[PDB]
PDB file of N, CA, C and O in Angstrom:
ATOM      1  N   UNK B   1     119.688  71.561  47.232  1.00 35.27           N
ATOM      2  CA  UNK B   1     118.340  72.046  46.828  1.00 35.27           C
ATOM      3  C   UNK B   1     118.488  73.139  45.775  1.00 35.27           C
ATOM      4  O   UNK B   1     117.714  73.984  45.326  1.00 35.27           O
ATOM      5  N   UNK B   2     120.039  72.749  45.492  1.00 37.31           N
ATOM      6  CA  UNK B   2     120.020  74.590  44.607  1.00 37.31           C
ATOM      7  C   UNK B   2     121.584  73.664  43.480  1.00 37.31           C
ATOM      8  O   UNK B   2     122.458  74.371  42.980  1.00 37.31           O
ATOM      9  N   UNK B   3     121.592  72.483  43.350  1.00 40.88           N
ATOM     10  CA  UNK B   3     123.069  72.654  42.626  1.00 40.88           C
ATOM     11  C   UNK B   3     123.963  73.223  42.972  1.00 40.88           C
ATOM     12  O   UNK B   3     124.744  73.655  42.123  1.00 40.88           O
ATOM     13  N   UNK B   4     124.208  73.456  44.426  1.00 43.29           N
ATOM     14  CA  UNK B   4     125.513  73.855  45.265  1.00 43.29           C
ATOM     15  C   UNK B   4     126.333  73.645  44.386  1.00 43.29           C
ATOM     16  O   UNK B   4     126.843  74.570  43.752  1.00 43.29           O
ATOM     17  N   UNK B   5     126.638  72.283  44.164  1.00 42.54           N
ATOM     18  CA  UNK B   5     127.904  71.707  44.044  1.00 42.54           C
ATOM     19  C   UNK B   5     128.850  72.321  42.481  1.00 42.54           C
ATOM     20  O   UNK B   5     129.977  72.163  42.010  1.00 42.54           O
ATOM     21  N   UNK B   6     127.687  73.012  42.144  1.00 44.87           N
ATOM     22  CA  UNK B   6     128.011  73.703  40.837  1.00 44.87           C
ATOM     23  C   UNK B   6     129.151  74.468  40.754  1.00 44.87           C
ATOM     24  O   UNK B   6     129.833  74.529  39.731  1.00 44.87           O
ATOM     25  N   UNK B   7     129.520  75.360  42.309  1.00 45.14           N
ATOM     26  CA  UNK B   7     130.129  76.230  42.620  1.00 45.14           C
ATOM     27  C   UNK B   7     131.582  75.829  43.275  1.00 45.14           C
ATOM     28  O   UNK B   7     132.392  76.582  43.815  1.00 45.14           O
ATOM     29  N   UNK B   8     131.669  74.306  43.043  1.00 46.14           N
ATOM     30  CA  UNK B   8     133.237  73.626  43.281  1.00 46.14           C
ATOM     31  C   UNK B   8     133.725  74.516  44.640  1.00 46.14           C
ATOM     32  O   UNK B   8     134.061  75.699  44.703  1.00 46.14           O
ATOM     33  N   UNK B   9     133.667  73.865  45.313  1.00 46.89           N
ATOM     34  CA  UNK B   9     134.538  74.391  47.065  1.00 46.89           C
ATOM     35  C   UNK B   9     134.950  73.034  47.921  1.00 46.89           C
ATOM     36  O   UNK B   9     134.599  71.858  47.839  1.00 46.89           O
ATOM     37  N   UNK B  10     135.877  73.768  48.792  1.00 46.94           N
ATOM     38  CA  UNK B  10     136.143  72.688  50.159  1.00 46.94           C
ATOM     39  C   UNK B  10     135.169  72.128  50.713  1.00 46.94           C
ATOM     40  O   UNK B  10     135.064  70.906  50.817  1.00 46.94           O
ATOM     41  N   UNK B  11     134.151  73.152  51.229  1.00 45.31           N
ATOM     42  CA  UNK B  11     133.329  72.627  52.243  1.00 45.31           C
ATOM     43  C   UNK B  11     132.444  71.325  52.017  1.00 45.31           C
ATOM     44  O   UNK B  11     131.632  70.927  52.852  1.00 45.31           O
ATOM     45  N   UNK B  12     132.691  70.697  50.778  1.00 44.79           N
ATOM     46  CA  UNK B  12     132.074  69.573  49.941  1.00 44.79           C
ATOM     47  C   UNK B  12     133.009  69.048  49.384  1.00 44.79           C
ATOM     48  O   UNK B  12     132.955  67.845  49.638  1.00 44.79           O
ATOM     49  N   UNK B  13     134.162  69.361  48.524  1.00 48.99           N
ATOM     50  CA  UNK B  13     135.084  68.399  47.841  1.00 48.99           C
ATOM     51  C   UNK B  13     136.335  67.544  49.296  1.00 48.99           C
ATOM     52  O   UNK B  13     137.341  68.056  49.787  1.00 48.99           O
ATOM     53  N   UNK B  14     135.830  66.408  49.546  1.00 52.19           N
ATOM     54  CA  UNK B  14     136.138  65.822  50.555  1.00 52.19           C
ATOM     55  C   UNK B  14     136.585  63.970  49.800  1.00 52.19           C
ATOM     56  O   UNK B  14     136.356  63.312  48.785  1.00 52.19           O
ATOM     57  N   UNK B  15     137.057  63.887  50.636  1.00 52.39           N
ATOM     58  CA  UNK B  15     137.826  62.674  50.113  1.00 52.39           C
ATOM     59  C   UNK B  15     136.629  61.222  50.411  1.00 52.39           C
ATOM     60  O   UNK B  15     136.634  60.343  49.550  1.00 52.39           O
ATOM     61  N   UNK B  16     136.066  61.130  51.124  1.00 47.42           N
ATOM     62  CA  UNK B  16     134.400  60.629  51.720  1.00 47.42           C
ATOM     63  C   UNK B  16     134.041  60.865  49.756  1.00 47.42           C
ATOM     64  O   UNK B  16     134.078  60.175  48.737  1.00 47.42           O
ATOM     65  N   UNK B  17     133.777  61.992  50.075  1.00 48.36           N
ATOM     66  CA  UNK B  17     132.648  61.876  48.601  1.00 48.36           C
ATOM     67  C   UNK B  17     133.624  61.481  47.280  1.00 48.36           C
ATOM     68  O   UNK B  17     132.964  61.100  46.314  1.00 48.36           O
ATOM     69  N   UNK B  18     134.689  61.500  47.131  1.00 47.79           N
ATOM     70  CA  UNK B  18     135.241  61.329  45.908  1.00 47.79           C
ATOM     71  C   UNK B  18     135.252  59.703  45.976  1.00 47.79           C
ATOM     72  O   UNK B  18     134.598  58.984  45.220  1.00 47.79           O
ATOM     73  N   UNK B  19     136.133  59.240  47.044  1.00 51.28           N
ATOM     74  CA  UNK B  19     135.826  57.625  46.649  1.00 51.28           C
ATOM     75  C   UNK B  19     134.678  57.060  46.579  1.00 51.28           C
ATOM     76  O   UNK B  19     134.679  55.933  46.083  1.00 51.28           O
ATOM     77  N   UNK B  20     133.382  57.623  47.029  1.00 50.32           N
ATOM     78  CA  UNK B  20     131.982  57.128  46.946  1.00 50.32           C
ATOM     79  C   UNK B  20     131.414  57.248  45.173  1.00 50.32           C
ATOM     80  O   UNK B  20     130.435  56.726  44.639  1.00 50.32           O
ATOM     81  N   UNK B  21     132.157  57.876  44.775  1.00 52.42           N
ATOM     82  CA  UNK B  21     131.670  58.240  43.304  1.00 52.42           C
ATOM     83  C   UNK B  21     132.563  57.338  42.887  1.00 52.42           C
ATOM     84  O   UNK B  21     132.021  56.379  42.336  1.00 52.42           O
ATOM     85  N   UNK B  22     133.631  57.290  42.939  1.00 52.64           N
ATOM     86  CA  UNK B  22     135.033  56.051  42.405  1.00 52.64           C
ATOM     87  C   UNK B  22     134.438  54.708  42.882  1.00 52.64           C
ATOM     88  O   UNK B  22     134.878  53.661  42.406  1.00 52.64           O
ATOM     89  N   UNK B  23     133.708  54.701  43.567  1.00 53.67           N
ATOM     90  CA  UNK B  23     132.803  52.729  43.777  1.00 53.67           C
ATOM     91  C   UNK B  23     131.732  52.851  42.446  1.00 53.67           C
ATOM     92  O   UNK B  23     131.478  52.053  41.543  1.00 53.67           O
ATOM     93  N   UNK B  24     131.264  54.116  42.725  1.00 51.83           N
ATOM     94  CA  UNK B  24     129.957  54.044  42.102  1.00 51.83           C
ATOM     95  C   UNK B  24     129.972  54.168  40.205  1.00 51.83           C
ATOM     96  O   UNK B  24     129.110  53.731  39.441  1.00 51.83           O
ATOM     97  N   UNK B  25     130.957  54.736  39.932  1.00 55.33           N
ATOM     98  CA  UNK B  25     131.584  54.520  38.374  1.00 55.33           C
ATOM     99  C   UNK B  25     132.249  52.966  38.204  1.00 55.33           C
ATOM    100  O   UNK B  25     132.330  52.406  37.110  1.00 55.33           O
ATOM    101  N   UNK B  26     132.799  52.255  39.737  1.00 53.66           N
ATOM    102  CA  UNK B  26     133.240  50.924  38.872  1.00 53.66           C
ATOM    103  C   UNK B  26     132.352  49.923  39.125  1.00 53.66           C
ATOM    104  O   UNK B  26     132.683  48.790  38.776  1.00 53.66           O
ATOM    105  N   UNK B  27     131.202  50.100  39.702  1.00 52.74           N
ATOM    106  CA  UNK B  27     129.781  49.150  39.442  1.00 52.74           C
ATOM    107  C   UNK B  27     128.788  49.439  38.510  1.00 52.74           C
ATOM    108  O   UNK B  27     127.729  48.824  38.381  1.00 52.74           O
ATOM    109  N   UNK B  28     129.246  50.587  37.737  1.00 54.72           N
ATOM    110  CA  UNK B  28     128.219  51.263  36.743  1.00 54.72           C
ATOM    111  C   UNK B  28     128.665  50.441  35.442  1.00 54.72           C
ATOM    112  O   UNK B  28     127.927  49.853  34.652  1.00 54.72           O
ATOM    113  N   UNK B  29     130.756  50.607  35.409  1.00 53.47           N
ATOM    114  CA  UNK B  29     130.718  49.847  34.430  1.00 53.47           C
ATOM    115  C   UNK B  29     130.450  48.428  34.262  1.00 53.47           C
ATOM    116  O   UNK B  29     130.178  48.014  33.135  1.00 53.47           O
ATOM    117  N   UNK B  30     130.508  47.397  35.552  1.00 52.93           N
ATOM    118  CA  UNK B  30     130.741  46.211  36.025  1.00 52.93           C
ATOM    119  C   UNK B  30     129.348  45.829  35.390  1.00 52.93           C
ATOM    120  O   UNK B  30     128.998  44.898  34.665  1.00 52.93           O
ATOM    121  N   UNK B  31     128.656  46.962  35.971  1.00 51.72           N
ATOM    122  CA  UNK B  31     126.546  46.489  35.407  1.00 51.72           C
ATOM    123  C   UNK B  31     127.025  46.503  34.110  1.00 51.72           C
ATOM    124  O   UNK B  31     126.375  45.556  33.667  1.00 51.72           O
ATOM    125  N   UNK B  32     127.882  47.004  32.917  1.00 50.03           N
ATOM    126  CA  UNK B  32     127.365  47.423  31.323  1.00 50.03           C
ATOM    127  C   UNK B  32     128.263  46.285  31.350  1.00 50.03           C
ATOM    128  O   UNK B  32     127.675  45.668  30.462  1.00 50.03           O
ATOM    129  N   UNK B  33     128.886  45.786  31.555  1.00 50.34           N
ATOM    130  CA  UNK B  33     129.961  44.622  31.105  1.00 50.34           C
ATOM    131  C   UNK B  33     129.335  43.276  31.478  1.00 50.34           C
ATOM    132  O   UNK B  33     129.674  42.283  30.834  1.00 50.34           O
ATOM    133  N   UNK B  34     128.268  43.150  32.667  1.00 50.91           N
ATOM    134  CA  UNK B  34     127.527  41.781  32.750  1.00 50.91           C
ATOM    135  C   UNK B  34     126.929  41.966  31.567  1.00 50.91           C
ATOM    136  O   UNK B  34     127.150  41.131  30.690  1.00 50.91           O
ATOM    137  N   UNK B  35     125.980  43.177  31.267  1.00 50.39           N
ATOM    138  CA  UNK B  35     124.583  43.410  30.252  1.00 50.39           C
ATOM    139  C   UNK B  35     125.286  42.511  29.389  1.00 50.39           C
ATOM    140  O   UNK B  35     125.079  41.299  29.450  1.00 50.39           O
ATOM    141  N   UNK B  36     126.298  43.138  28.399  1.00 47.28           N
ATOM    142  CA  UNK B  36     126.836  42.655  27.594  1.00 47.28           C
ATOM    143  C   UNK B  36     127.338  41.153  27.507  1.00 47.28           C
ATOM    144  O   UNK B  36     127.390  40.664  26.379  1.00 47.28           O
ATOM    145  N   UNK B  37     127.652  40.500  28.420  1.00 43.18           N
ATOM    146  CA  UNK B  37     128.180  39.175  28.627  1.00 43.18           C
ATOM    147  C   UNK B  37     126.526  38.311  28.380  1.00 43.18           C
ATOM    148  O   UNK B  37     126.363  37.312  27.680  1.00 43.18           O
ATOM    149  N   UNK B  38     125.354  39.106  29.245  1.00 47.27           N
ATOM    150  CA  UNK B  38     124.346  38.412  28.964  1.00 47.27           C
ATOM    151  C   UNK B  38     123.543  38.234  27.375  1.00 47.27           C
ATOM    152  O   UNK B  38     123.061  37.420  26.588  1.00 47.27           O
ATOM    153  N   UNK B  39     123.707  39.052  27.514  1.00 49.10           N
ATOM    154  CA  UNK B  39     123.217  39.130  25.431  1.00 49.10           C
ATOM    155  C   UNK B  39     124.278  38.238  25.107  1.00 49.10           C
ATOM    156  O   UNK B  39     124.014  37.045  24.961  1.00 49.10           O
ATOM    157  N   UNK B  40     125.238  38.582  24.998  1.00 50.19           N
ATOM    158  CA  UNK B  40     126.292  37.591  23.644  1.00 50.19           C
ATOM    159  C   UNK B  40     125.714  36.282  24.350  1.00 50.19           C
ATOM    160  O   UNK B  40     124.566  36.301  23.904  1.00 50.19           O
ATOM    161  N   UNK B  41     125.772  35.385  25.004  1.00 50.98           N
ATOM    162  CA  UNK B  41     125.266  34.422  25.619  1.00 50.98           C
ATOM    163  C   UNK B  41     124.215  33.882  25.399  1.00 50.98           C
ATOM    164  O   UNK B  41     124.049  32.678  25.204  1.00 50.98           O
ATOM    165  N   UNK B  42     123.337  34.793  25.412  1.00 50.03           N
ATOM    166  CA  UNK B  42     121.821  34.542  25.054  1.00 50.03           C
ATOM    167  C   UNK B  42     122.140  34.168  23.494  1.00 50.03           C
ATOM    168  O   UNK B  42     121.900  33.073  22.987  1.00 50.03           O
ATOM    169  N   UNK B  43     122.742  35.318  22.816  1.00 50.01           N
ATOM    170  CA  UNK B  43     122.816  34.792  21.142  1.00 50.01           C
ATOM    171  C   UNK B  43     123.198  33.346  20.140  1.00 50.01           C
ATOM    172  O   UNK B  43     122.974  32.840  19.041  1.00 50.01           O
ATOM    173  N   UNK B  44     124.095  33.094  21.706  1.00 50.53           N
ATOM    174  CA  UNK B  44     125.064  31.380  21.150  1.00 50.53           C
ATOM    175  C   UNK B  44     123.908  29.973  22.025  1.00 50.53           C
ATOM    176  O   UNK B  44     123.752  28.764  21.855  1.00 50.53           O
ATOM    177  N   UNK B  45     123.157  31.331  23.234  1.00 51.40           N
ATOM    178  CA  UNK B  45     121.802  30.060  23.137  1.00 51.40           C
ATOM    179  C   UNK B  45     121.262  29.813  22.315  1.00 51.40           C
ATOM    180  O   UNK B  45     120.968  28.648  22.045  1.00 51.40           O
ATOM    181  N   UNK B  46     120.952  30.758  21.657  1.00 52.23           N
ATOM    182  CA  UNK B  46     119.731  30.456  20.484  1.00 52.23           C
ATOM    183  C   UNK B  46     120.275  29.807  19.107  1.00 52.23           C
ATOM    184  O   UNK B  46     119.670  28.931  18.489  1.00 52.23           O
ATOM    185  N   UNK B  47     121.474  30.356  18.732  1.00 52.15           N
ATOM    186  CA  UNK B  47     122.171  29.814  17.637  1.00 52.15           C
ATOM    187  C   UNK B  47     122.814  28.141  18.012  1.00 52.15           C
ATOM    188  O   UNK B  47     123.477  27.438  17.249  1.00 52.15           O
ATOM    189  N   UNK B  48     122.395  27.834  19.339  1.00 55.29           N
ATOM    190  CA  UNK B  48     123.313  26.666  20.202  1.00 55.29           C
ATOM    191  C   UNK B  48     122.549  26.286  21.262  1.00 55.29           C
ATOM    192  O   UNK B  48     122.939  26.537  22.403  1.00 55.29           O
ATOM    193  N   UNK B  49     121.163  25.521  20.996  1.00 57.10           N
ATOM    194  CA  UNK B  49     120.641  25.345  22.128  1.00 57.10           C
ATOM    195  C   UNK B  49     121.205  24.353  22.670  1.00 57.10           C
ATOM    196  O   UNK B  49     120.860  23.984  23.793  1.00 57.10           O
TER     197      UNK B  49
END
């Protein structure tokens, strides 16, 4: 409620929260790498129906 986490400590830097952020960065890129697969795709539809 205040940006705790601003203040870097134990009582929060826990191994729980670090791999939850390490899933959540490799489905963030996984989403920008479909986006991308869907456009180029879409482009060789249209140029290639």
């Amino acid at each position: 409620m205040s940006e705790p986490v601003s203040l870097l400590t134990p009582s929060d830097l826990d191994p729980l929260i670090l791999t939850l952020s390490l899933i959540l960065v490799v489905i963030l890129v996984l989403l920008t790498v479909l986006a991308l697969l869907s456009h180029r795709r879409a482009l060789k539809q249209k140029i290639w129906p």
